[PDB]
Amino acid sequence: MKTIFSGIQPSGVITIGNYIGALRQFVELQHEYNCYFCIVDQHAITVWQDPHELRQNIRRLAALYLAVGIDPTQATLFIQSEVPAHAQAAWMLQCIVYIGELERMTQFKEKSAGKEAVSAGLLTYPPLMAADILLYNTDIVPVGEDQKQHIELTRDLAERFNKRYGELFTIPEARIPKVGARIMSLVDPTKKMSKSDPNPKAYITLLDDAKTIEKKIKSAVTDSEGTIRYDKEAKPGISNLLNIYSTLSGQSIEELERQYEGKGYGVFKADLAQVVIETLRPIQERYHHWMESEELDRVLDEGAEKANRVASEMVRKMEQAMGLGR
Amino acid sequence: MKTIFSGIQPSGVITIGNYIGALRQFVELQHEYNCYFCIVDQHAITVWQDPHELRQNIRRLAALYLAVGIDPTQATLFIQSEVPAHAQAAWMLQCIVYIGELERMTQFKEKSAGKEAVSAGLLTYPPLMAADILLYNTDIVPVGEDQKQHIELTRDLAERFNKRYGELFTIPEARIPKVGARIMSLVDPTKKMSKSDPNPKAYITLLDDAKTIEKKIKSAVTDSEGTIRYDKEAKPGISNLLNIYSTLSGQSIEELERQYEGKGYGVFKADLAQVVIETLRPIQERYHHWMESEELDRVLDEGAEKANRVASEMVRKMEQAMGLGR
Numbered sequence: 102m103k104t105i106f107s108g109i110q111p112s113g114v115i116t117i118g119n120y121i122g123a124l125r126q127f128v129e130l131q132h133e134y135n136c137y138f139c140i141v142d143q144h145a146i147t148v149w150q151d152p153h154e155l156r157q158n159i160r161r162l163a164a165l166y167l168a169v170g171i172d173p174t175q176a177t178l179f180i181q182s183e184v185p186a187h188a189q190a191a192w193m194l195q196c197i198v199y200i201g202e203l204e205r206m207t208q209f210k211e212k213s214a215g216k217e218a219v220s221a222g223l224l225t226y227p228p229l230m231a232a233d234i235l236l237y238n239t240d241i242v243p244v245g246e247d248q249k250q251h252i253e254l255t256r257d258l259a260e261r262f263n264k265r266y267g268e269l270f271t272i273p274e275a276r277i278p279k280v281g282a283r284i285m286s287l288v289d290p291t292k293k294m295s296k297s298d299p300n301p302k303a304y305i306t307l308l309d310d311a312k313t314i315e316k317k318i319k320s321a322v323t324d325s326e327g328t329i330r331y332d333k334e335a336k337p338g339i340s341n342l343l344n345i346y347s348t349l350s351g352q353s354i355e356e357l358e359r360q361y362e363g364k365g366y367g368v369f370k371a372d373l374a375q376v377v378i379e380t381l382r383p384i385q386e387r388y389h390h391w392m393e394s395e396e397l398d399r400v401l402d403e404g405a406e407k408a409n410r411v412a413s414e415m416v417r418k419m420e421q422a423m424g425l426g427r
Numbered sequence: 428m429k430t431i432f433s434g435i436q437p438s439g440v441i442t443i444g445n446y447i448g449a450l451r452q453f454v455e456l457q458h459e460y461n462c463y464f465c466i467v468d469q470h471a472i473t474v475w476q477d478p479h480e481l482r483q484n485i486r487r488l489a490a491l492y493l494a495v496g497i498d499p500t501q502a503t504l505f506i507q508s509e510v511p512a513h514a515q516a517a518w519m520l521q522c523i524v525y526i527g528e529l530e531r532m533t534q535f536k537e538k539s540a541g542k543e544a545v546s547a548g549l550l551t552y553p554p555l556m557a558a559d560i561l562l563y564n565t566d567i568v569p570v571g572e573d574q575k576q577h578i579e580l581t582r583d584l585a586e587r588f589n590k591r592y593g594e595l596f597t598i599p600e601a602r603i604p605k606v607g608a609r610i611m612s613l614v615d616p617t618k619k620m621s622k623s624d625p626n627p628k629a630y631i632t633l634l635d636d637a638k639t640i641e642k643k644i645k646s647a648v649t650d651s652e653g654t655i656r657y658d659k660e661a662k663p664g665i666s667n668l669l670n671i672y673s674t675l676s677g678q679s680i681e682e683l684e685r686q687y688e689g690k691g692y693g694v695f696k697a698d699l700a701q702v703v704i705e706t707l708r709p710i711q712e713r714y715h716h717w718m719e720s721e722e723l724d725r726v727l728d729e730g731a732e733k734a735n736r737v738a739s740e741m742v743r744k745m746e747q748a749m750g751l752g753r
C-alpha cells in the first residue's frame with residue numbers, strides 16, 4: 102500500500118485553514134495508506150519560541166490531531182525531534198541543496214521579509230522538510246497549496262540524490278484539495294488565512310467558542326452584491342466563505358449557490374457559523390479529554406517507536422550511499 | 428579533569444601541517460584531559476565526495492590517529508556520523524546563528540570563492556562544528572590557527588544559547604601551538620600548507636616515502652641569503668622550514684639557528700628531510716598495521732559508544748532548555 106507523510110508545526114494558533122487544507126485529508130486517507138503524521142517541533146524553532154509555550158503547543162497539537170479523528174491504529178503520530186533521523190537526513194540533504202535554491206523559497210522570503218538578522222534555520226527549513234518526507238519512502242504528501250513549492254524542492258533533492266548516489270528515494274507527489282487548498286483571511290480575503298495574523302478576526306482557531314465563531318463569520322468581509330455566487334476574482338470574500346461552507350458541510354459549491362438563490366449574506370453567514378460550530382464542538386470536547394489523559398503520551402511514544410524504526414533504516418541506506426561512516 | 432575536543436576531516440591528503448598543528452597536541456595532552464577526537468565525515472560531505480574514497484579516507488584517518496599515538500585507553504576516537512547527536516545539536520544551533528554570521532566566515536568565503544552554486548552545507552559548516560565541540564562540555568579545543576574563527580563563532584553561539592535558555596554550555600577556548608600553528612606551503616611559503624593544494628610539492632603527506640620527502644624539502648622555496656635565521660616577513664621559506672624542524676625535532680628555533688650558524692641551505696635541507704623521515708617512518712609502519720587489523724573497527728566501535736552516551740545526554744538537556752519534545 103502507498104505511503105503518506107504530512108507535518109504541522111506546533112503553534113499558539115491552529116486554524117480552520119489547517120483543518121480544511123490538511124487535517125481533513127489526513128482523516129480521509131488514513132485507512133487507505135501507511136501514514137506518518139508529524140508534529141514538526143524542529144521546524145518550529147526556526148523562529149524564536151518560548152520554551153514552556155512550545156512544550157504546551159506540542160501537546161496541544163497532538164491532542165488536536167487525535168481530536169479530529171487521526172487513529173493510532175491506522176497512522177503513526179509522532180514528534181519530529183523524537184526521531185534523530187530527521188536531523189541526520191536534513192544534514193545530508195543540506196549538503197546537496199544549493200544556496201540559491203533555498204533563497205528562492207517564497208516561504209523563506211515572506212518569513213524573512215524586512216528582517217534584520219535572519220536566523221539560519223529559516224533559510225535551511227526546506228532540507229529538513231525534504232528529509233521529513235523522504236525518510237519514509239513517501240508517495241503522497243497531503244497539504245494545502247502553500248506547501249507546493251517546498252514539495253517541488255523535495256522532488257528536486259530526491260532526484261539529485263538518486264542521480265548522484267544510486268536510486269534510493271521514491272519521488273513524492275503533493276495531494277492538494279480541489280476546494281479549500283488555500284482558505285483566505287476573513288478580514289482580507291485576498292490574503293491567506295494565517296496562524297500568525299496579528300488580527301484574531303482573520304482566522305478561526307480550532308478552539309474558538311460559539312460566540313467567537315459567530316462574531317468572526319459575521320464580520321467576514323464580503324461585497325455589495327448580496328449575491329451568493331462563487332467568483333474568486335470579483336467576490337473573494339463570499340467565495341472564500343463558500344469554500345469553508347462547502348468543505349465543512351459536504352455540500353458542493355453548486356448546491357450552496359442554489360440553496361441560497363435569492364437570499365442575503367446575513368442568513369448565509371448565520372448558517373455558516375452554525376456549520377463551523379457543529380464541526381468544532383465535538384473536536385473541542387475530544388481535545389480536552391486528550392489533554393487530560395496519560396494516553397496522549399502513550400500514543401506519541403508508540404508513534405516515535407515506529408517512526409524511528411523506519412527512519413533510522415533509511416538513514417543507514419543514505420549514509421551507505423554517500424559513503425559516510427563504515 | 429578538563430575536557431578536550433578536536434576533529435579532522437577524512438580526506439585524500441593528511442599533511443605534516445595537520446600533524447604539527449593538531450595531531451602532535453592530541454598526543455601531548457591525551458593523558459591530562461578527558462579527550463574526544465573525531466573523524467568529521469559529516470563535515471567532509473559539505474563538498475562532493477566519491478563514496479568509496481570517503482569510506483576509505485575515514486578508515487585511513489582512524490589508522491593515522493592511532494599510528495601517531497592516540498591511545499584508546501586515554502581518549503575516545505570516533506566517527507562523527509556515528510553519533511546522531513551532532514546532527515541534532517547542529518540543527519538547534521543553526522536556529523540560533525544568524526545568516527550574516529555564517530557568511531563572514533573566512534573558511535566559507537575561501538571554499539566558496541569563484542563558485543557558481545554553492546552547496547548549503549558549505550555555509551552551515553560552523554553550527555555543526557560548534558555542536559561537535561559543545562556537545563562534550565568542552566574546555567579546550569586544540570587546533571591550528573586556521574580554526575580560530577570557527578571557535579570564536581562557537582563561543583558566540585554557546586553564550587547566545589546560555590543567555591536565551593539557561594546556562595548549559597561551557598564556553599570552550601582554542602589551544603593553538605606557539606610554533607607551527609600555521610605551517611606554510613613549501614612551494615609558496617606566503618600561503619598555508621593545504622590538503623587540497625593542486626601542487627603535491629606544496630605539502631608533505633603523512634604517507635610520503637623517504638625519496639618523496641627528500642624531493643619536497645629540497646625543492647622548498649627559500650631565498651638568496653644563505654642564512655638560516657627566523658624572519659617570517661623577510662624569509663618566509665626558511666622560517667617555515669625552521670618551524671617544521673623545530674616542532675619535529677624538539678629543538679628550539681634558537682638552538683637550530685646556532686647549530687646552523689655559517690652553514691648553507693643544502694645541509695640544512697638534507698638534515699631536515701632526515702628529521703621528517705625519522706618522524707614519518709614509525710607512523711607509517713603502525714598505520715599499515717592498523718589498516719590490516721580488525722582492532723581498528725573495535726576501537727571506533729568503543730569510541731562511538733562512549734561519545735553517544737555523553738552527546739545524547741547533552742542533546743536531551745539542550746531540547747529541555749528550548750522546550751522541544753516532551
Ligand SMILES: Nc1ncnc2c1ncn2[C@@H]1O[C@H](COP(=O)(O)OC(=O)[C@@H](N)Cc2c[nH]c3ccccc23)[C@@H](O)[C@H]1O
Nearest residue numbers: 107108109110118119122123230233244245282283284294
Ligand atoms: N489557509 C490555509 N488553507 C489551507 N491549508 C492551509 C492553510 N494554512 C495552512 N494550511 C495547511 O496546513 C498544514 C499545516 O500548516 P503549517 O503552517 O504548520 O505547515 C508547515 O509549516 C509545513 N512546513 C510543515 C511540514 C514540515 N514538514 C513537512 C513535511 C510534509 C508536509 C508538511 C510539513 C499544511 O498542509 C498547510 O499547507
Ligand SMILES: Nc1ncnc2c1ncn2[C@@H]1O[C@H](COP(=O)(O)OC(=O)[C@@H](N)Cc2c[nH]c3ccccc23)[C@@H](O)[C@H]1O
Nearest residue numbers: 433434435436444445448449556559570571608609610620
Ligand atoms: N598548515 C597547517 N598548519 C597547522 N595546522 C594545520 C594546518 N592545516 C591544517 N591544520 C590543522 O589540522 C587540523 C585538521 O585540519 P582540517 O582541515 O581537517 O580541520 C577542519 O576542517 C575542522 N573544520 C575540523 C573540525 C570539525 N569539527 C571540529 C571541532 C573542533 C576542532 C576541529 C573540528 C585542525 O586543527 C587544523 O587547524
Ligand SMILES: [N+]
Nearest residue numbers: 131132134175
Ligand atoms: N493505515
Ligand SMILES: [N+]
Nearest residue numbers: 457458460501
Ligand atoms: N585521559
